[PDB]
Amino acid sequence: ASRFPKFSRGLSQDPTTRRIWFGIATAHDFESHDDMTEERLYQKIFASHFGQLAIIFLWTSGNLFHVAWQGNFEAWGQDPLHVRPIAHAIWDPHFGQPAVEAFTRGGASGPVNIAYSGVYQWWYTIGLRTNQDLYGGSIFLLFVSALFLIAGWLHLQPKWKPSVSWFKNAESRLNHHLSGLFGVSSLAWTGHLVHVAIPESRGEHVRWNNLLTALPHPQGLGPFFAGQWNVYAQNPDSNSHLFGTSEGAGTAILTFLGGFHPQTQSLWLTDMAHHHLAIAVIFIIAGHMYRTNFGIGHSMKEILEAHTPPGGRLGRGHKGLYDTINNSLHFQLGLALASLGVITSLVAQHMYSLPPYAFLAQDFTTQAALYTHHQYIAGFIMTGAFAHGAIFFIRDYNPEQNKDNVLARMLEHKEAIISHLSWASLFLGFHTLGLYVHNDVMLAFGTPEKQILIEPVFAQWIQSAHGKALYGFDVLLSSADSPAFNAGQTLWLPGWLDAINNNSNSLFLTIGPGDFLVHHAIALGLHTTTLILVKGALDARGSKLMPDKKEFGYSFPCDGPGRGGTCDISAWDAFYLAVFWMLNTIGWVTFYWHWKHITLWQGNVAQFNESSTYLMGWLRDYLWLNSSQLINGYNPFGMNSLSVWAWMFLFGHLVWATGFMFLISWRGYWQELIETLAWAHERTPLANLVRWKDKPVALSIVQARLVGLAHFSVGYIFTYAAFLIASTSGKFG
Amino acid sequence: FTPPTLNADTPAPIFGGSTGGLLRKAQVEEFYVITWESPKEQIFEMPTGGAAIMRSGPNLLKLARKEQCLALGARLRTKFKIQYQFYRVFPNGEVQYLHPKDGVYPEKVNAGRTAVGVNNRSIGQNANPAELKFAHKQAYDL
Amino acid sequence: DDPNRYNGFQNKFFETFAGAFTKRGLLLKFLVLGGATTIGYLGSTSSGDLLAIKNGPKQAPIMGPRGRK
Amino acid sequence: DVAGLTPCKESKGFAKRQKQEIKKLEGRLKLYAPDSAPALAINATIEKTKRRFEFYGNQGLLCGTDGLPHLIVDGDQAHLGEFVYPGLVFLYIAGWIGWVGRAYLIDVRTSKKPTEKEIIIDVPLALRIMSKGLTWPVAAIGELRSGKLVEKSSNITVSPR
Amino acid sequence: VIGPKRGSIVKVLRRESYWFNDTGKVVAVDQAPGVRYPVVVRFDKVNYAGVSTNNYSPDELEQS
Amino acid sequence: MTASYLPSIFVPLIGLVFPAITMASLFIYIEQDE
Amino acid sequence: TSISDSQIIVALVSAFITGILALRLGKSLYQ
Amino acid sequence: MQDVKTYLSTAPVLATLWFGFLAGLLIEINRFFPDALVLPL
Amino acid sequence: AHSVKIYDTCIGCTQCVRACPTDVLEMVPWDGCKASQIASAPRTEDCVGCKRCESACPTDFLSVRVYLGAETTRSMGLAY
Ligand code: CLA
Ligand code: CLA
Ligand code: CLA
Ligand code: CLA
Ligand code: CLA
Ligand code: CLA
Ligand code: CLA
Ligand SMILES: CC1=C(/C=C/C(C)=C/C=C/C(C)=C/C=C/C=C(C)/C=C/C=C(C)/C=C/C2=C(C)CCCC2(C)C)C(C)(C)CCC1
Ligand code: SF4
Structure with a gap:
């Protein structure tokens, strides 16, 4: 009767706590709301975009205000290489005196947080010098966010609402x-x-x-x-x-x-x-x-129709793609997220090797945090792109208009695509794991000379083609007689060659067999995550096990225990399974980046070059070795400024295990237990007077998967962030 | 077929009590009542957990869910060869005859029964969701 | 359902007018105001000894590695 | 030299590792009587290590910074024995196995009860199939060119689109 | 007659069938006017549910 | 810090009072029958 | 140099106005 | 002997025999030709 | 509650009716098969969504299909 989920009649009539959960979790799926028109859908999306822009600008203005009010921006600017940036002040009533005096850094008069976002370097580079400049910027961005809120409210009014054709x-x-x-x-x-x-x-x-x-x-x-x-x-x-x-x-x-x-x-x-x-x-x-x-x-549209090979190898080519793409918001969202994930990976990979901000290369913790941040963001964005491609196929793909064009041809030979992805993943995994285990066994038996150490000669040849003279290939800017070298020697090469032949920075780091093995592990991760995601996207409309999967939607629990069992048969479940693999792959990527840069910054790169070829080296010389200062943040003998990171480390471990709980035990145990507890409450005196209104039920299957995934991801992120920051800041090296 | 009325003078089976029984739902929303005829005093298993003796004659048992009524009825039919029928009882005293709507069990085809939910096409001949975009109907509803 | 429990209860009826028969209007607003103001006053007027965060640092800065401060 | 790698014959790290391993084995040896069986085992270990390092040196392996042979898999003629030659041997063996397995499956799809033939392998049939794997590449090329290797897409089960 | 001869080898054109693009043997065809799927097909391999037979209309079966 | 008392004011509010009001309002809203 | 209390209250008032506009936009999105 | 030969031809028994033979072959090869990273030719 | 649909591929084996734990399906006269009957779901409001009727259907793909949704009181199988 028009309860909390006012956009869904079915949820409103649910007398259980499932109503609350699903109303919270299905609010932004505008296309699924009752009595939804495309005009209202587009206008709601427009106003939500305005709201998001306002939120982003408020977030940055708050960063500016806190740095201006509680920071040492001027002191840092006067002396960047020996001043730690301050993020914001701490007012925790739960602190003790040792915690008060442990967190007083950066020349503050009280407990403060040390910023690791690079905002100090970025704002110093773009000309901001004093706290008044930052305050003015914060006020200006407050005004900008207010203007965007006004615009979002305005375009929702009857006389300023845009039409569907305008949106198309x-x-x-x-x-x-x-x-x-x-x-x-x-x-x-x-x-x-x-x-x-x-x-x-x-x-x-x-x-x-x-x-x-x-x-x-x-x-x-x-x-x-x-x-x-x-x-x-x-x-x-x-x-x-x-x-x-x-x-x-x-x-x-x-x-x-x-x-x-x-x-x-x-x-x-x-x-x-x-x-x-x-x-x-x-x-x-x-x-x-x-x-x-x-x-x-x-x-x-005419460009798309014109681009069809005459030989018929592509079929009808790109005919009908304009209408398919312009009529489907999920296709546009998937394309946008794909490009954004690629570009975020590019940003992460280009800012550590080509630092654009002054005194940012010297800030090692800031660089590591920025790289890990943008890489994890990129991975999540890629998973979202593939999920929305699956949603496009389920909800927005019309085979009638997309007849024998490129999309229909992808659907036609999807088995070949999935089988070749499976082969690539299997080959990479088998051989990389086997080489790693071979190296482990050789180190275990005391014979390191028997390792299978494959030199990454292709990447080293590319480095030589970029001007790296360490490998002696002497070609393409590594040779004086090359036409490229002669063309570039007047404009950038005097600086580029000097920067790339400097081994003290991260511009084209030296690579070896460990770099070969870890890049092949990265390829394995990318290929397997893509396998899961593409399999979900192309089997979304149906399969041999569930030919009518399109009528059941994107996220449904299963199709029952018939036909052998149909757990995780939806495309949403493919996304669920691919989130684990993307987390693993970005974990490998960040582990490599972090270890390579720890051994580079400390000046002893031999440790990485000798220990990264076998997994015991990864466990001992990177994880066990660099966690010593982390786990000593607080101990029976006292505590220091790394206590917060130790606490967050343990916190992430705990959330990871709770995610395990939601992922292993599935539903029925808890439903029976809740039945028992409902009986107990109804039969207990002085407490049966208090009555619930929503009948308590166990979490649904899809909800259980999503909650377990959220716990898993939060634990992953917090644990690794705590370890990264604590091990890069406890030893500034 | 005239549905039978729910008699209020039908003795219940000999049961010693259980924690699996009627709860607040039975008194605020609905419950169910199953009746069957037995030729002799025999022990059966309660669907809520336990054992009871059914009367040598009419029986009357209160349940909280329809599924428990079907479970007990199926056991009675395939084990004791006993005909059964149950009703849905509301807090206001409304009684609805449920299981043999026409007096014949649903497993046996009976004339006068209307086809509800029957689609005159193959399951794979459904319309695509894309064609039904922004229309408040499902592919299987056509 | 025995109705004879208390004898002297005029005071309790007399003193409780702000809560009874108010529900969302008076009791809730009074509680919000008297919790917000109460906690604000306590957190703003607490002395250094009682609360360590407001006591402030007393020892010299410990200073960080690589000479960064 | 192929990515700044010195040959292991004149690699100082390679010799250092030789010396360290031999010294460790001799230190383990000092606590046993010369005639004892453990002493014989440790001396066999020392001889094994010496011959291993001599063999690694004699084949022109490339040692990097410190002593560790590194493998070049770019197709260089001076390193064909690291990946190309054993790689080809592997390809011959793997193709043997797969080809004979495929042949057995073909030869048991015409049987009356193929599943029983898969759980209970026809050892004579399997062995005379396995004997045919000697010339597997020729048979593979012949089947590919004749068209008996790849099934037509019209006779393969596919899911709805 | 209605459809294929008894015992003939027929290929399935039902996209939603487990045996699409697969060959089976016709067991029986019912000539009753009104039956929508009269052709009975036996298959050498079972589906996920374990059933090796099905019913098809003549228009979704072709002769080899 | 220009106003040291201002954290001691704001943190308790957004920490305890704002959640109290928010959760009370949302609980009243999601339990409406209408 | 350090910001003053006048600047602090100006920022607070601007944030209050932005909150009013946010609540307005939320009410516009609601219906 | 028909039934005994049929049992010995089952998948697990034949797998055990074949993999044991392969393991023995590889182990003996490593006995006489150990610790080789490069195929000498 | 949930939506249950029957298709013309049904052969009137009645196996879906016998597997239903809440008595949702029933057999009605029909003329499209040898058995001269077809399943029907006149009282889907009692359906819980177990899809036991789906597991009991012998057709290649199911003549009886359950689509779930709503999740009312009778659907959730709650005794409280
Ligand atoms: C010149 C005219 C013009 C301009 C300026 C805009 C501007 C905008 N439109 Mg568009 N629009 C226009 C005409 C225009 N529109 C027309 C004619 C129509 C149709 C008739 C539309 C229809 C339209 C729709 C339907 C929507 C918009 C939206 C938007 C806004 C979204 C911006 C955003 O989120 O990403 C801006 C991002 C960037 C500028 C960054 C790009 C940089 C790339 C990635 C390279 C990397 C550089 C890197 C980020 C720099 C590092 C910085 C670092 C130091 C921090 C943006 C303000 C969207 C919106 O949010 O509305 C509220 C939306 O939904 N517009
Ligand atoms: C969850 C999202 C998220 C978050 C929290 C961050 C967080 C961060 N990013 Mg990352 N980033 C992300 C996603 C994210 N990023 C993605 C998806 C991309 C790919 C496009 C990037 C690309 C990126 C780059 C390239 C850089 C960052 C940087 C930063 C840091 C500075 C804070 C910031 O962005 O300023 C917030 C700033 C704003 C919201 C203002 C942006 C608006 C610009 C200036 C618009 C300019 C147009 C202008 C109005 C036109 C003038 C009009 C007229 C006069 C002509 C911080 C660690 C920077 C960094 O590490 O510095 C240390 C940096 O250089 N990010
Ligand atoms: C431009 C970005 C963008 C946009 C506009 C959308 C928009 C949409 N997405 Mg997509 N999505 C995106 C990015 C985006 N998504 C990315 C990056 C991913 C990968 C993670 C996904 C993955 C994804 C899936 C898998 C699904 C959607 C769905 C949807 C739709 C409904 C979302 C909903 O119900 O919201 C409500 C919001 C939520 C339920 C999120 C709740 C909060 C989550 C669980 C994170 C909480 C973490 C933690 C608890 C908080 C921090 C705690 C702290 C202690 C650390 C909507 C059209 C759904 C859809 O279309 O249905 C058919 C759907 O099934 N999206
Ligand atoms: C260390 C943990 C681990 C490992 C090794 C694997 C391994 C694999 N996963 Mg799994 N997975 C894991 C964790 C793991 N996963 C987790 C936590 C999740 C999240 C739920 C997933 C989710 C997931 C999905 C969704 C998919 C995979 C896929 C794959 C395959 C990727 C290709 C590959 O690496 O081939 C190389 C194979 C291996 C590394 C497997 C181990 C091989 C062993 C070491 C060899 C045998 C040794 C020995 C003879 C056995 C002795 C036992 C006994 C006889 C005595 C592979 C089988 C994909 C797949 O199957 O595509 C083909 C796929 O679709 N996995
Ligand atoms: C999103 C940006 C952002 C964030 C995360 C923070 C975070 C914080 N602020 Mg700051 N603040 C901001 C913007 C922000 N601030 C702005 C714009 C102003 C100017 C008015 C201030 C002024 C301010 C003061 C004066 C104080 C803090 C304090 C604090 C801390 C305690 C929380 C508190 O009392 O908030 C109070 C915050 C406000 C009064 C500002 C209003 C809220 C802003 C505009 C953000 C709201 C919208 C945002 C998108 C969140 C959406 C919710 C959810 C969907 C994520 C905490 C570290 C306290 C502190 O330093 O303790 C040590 C303190 O005393 N803030
Ligand atoms: C980028 C962030 C973002 C954006 C743009 C939106 C946008 C929207 N959401 Mg979503 N949502 C978000 C994050 C976001 N949400 C998050 C993180 C959650 C939690 C998981 C939800 C959970 C959620 C649910 C459960 C529902 C929505 C709904 C809505 C719609 C707004 C209607 C409503 O009830 O407003 C709520 C807010 C208001 C009515 C007014 C308050 C506005 C903000 C939140 C606070 C303003 C400041 C506040 C008064 C304090 C300042 C004090 C003083 C200065 C005044 C709109 C499409 C509703 C809807 O109709 O969906 C279609 C709905 O039912 N959302
Ligand atoms: C895929 C990963 C991988 C790869 C490529 C290798 C590769 C290798 N390992 Mg490693 N290993 C791995 C995984 C891997 N291993 C794993 C997972 C483990 C843990 C169990 C080990 C544990 C391990 C140990 C403990 C040892 C090795 C050794 C070896 C080497 C020789 C082994 C051997 O029997 O050669 C001998 C050569 C043969 C058996 C030749 C094949 C003979 C067949 C029958 C063909 C016959 C000829 C054919 C019919 C005709 C071909 C044409 C002709 C012209 C040649 C080789 C470099 C050994 C070594 O020497 O280290 C350097 C060694 O001691 N490995
Ligand atoms: C499922 C799907 C989807 C999604 C998808 C995706 C997500 C994808 C992705 C994709 C991607 C992610 C891709 C990427 C790509 C890349 C590339 C293609 C690259 C290229 C490169 C180049 C070409 C280079 C060149 C160069 C170099 C090498 C360096 C130097 C310079 C130069 C420039 C020369 C959608 C929604 C759409 C729809 C449906 C389907
Ligand atoms: S739906 Fe299936 S199980 Fe039910 S009667 Fe028809 S064929 Fe038999």
């Missing part, structure tokens, strides 16, 4: 997002870099009160409009330049040096400015491709 205008949206959202934003950012960040890094102080007075270049906009742009690169910064100080500074605003700043071990600000200018030009050009209102452009 793909060409105009692409044009505007490529030109303005991507291109003009990058143009504005390079304008900031030219006007504020670079002068700040060269000792000048440019703010709003002198933006029109401060001259970014002595020859302002003359050579720009005369075509002689080289004037903006005549006087680059010297190698004796000190960041933020006029000593050794130059006058060029758009250089092309490449490599790293010698004192900050980061990319040059002028190189990044020229980067953003170039990509802004490219994006603004690219955003003029499609046809909106002026008779010029492209018709994306």
